[PDB]
Design an enzyme around this catalytic site. Structure first.
Site, short mmCIF file in Angstrom:
data_model
loop_
_atom_site.label_atom_id
_atom_site.label_comp_id
_atom_site.label_asym_id
_atom_site.label_seq_id
_atom_site.Cartn_x
_atom_site.Cartn_y
_atom_site.Cartn_z
N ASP B 11 0.85 -1.17 0.00
CA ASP B 11 0.00 0.00 0.00
C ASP B 11 0.90 1.24 0.00
OD1 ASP B 11 -2.40 1.57 0.32
OD2 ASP B 11 -2.08 1.56 2.50
N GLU B 13 1.32 5.72 -0.71
CA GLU B 13 0.68 7.03 -0.62
C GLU B 13 1.50 7.85 -1.61
OE1 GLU B 13 -2.07 7.86 0.72
OE2 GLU B 13 -2.32 6.04 1.90
N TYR B 128 4.00 -10.65 -12.74
CA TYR B 128 3.36 -9.61 -13.53
C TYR B 128 1.86 -9.40 -13.27
CZ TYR B 128 1.53 -13.24 -16.72
OH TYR B 128 0.85 -14.33 -17.23
#
Lengths: 180, 180
Positions: B11, B13, B128
């Site tokens: 994750d 930002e 991928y």
């Protein structure tokens, strides 16, 4: 009949994997209803790109695209990024309202990368979410490899058949992998 | 212990939505086993970017990252893109071999776009494919909306907490939306 529950399926071809260096050379789209019934098949368009850009293609791309005949169609094409973008939107606007459908297909993350750069308006027509069939395929081989034997893609160059195969793949997963 | 079946959850930002104009300002990673059990949580790093780069942020971004305190963490951070990339890689290399795990999380297609441009070595470490939980959420909403009410996210500024909730969400779907 533009229904908010309709799904936009897309498939592009490009000169390479790098959005900043490569270009879109083919675009195809189709719309299904929420239940994957194909409602309309949009235009398959070879996107014109200069001879200098085409010279930039790596070894494997030049071979694949020259062998499929795409290189010839691209050179004979009179529609660049914007023109192909406009025709695709003109088709989509009649079947799905803006911002409602996530982008659908197999590994459409790579396709969306090129849309972001070269076809911003079409990119913004999609909902921000991704509906990648390969995600379910990945989960199936990890949690239920059995089903992968029951469905097998034939492989093809025709953009539309590739998409119809993605739709079929997801329809297979809906019946035997997803728990409705 | 690196296991070919382990999943890499990530994750990020960013200062904005445009990879060519924006930068990564935070990165957090976690590894789970094939069955979604969290094995190890990696480092959460605020990625340093110049004061000028930070001035190119839009209203929504500057407000969100300033309130959360991320902007202060960024200015003080002594780890730029490369160094944050190296640290993430040292962690991952201990839990998953290269090219085995697809990128996992919520709408990580957008995150991968930044990895391609600013942390290409980390990007190449992933298989991928994409494992976007939001793809399942989208299908559940259209084919079995009832199950949606049974799951909820708190919403936080802590990256790791967001990733743990992504994992939980996928676990929820595996139980209520997938066939054994």
């Amino acid at each position: 009949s533009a229904n908010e529950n309709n799904l936009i399926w897309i498939d592009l071809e490009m000169t390479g994997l790098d959005p900043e260096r490569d270009r879109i050379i083919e675009i195809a789209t189709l719309v299904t209803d929420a239940n994957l019934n194909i409602l309309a098949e949009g235009p398959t368009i070879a996107v014109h790109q200069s001879d200098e850009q085409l010279a930039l293609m790596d070894d494997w791309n030049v071979r694949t695209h020259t062998a499929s005949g795409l290189v010839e169609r691209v050179k004979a094409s009179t529609m660049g990024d914007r023109e192909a973008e406009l025709a695709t939107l003109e088709f989509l606007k009649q079947w799905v309202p803006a911002g409602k459908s996530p982008i659908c297909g197999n590994s459409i993350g790579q396709d969306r990368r090129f849309l972001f750069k070269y076809m911003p308006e079409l990119e913004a027509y999609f909902h921000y979410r991704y509906l990648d069939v390969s995600t379910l395929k990945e989960l199936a081989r990890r949690w239920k490899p059995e089903i992968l034997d029951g469905f097998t893609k034939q492989g093809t160059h025709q953009a539309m058949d590739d998409i119809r195969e993605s739709v079929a793949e997801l329809a297979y997963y809906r019946e035997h992998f997803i728990k409705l």
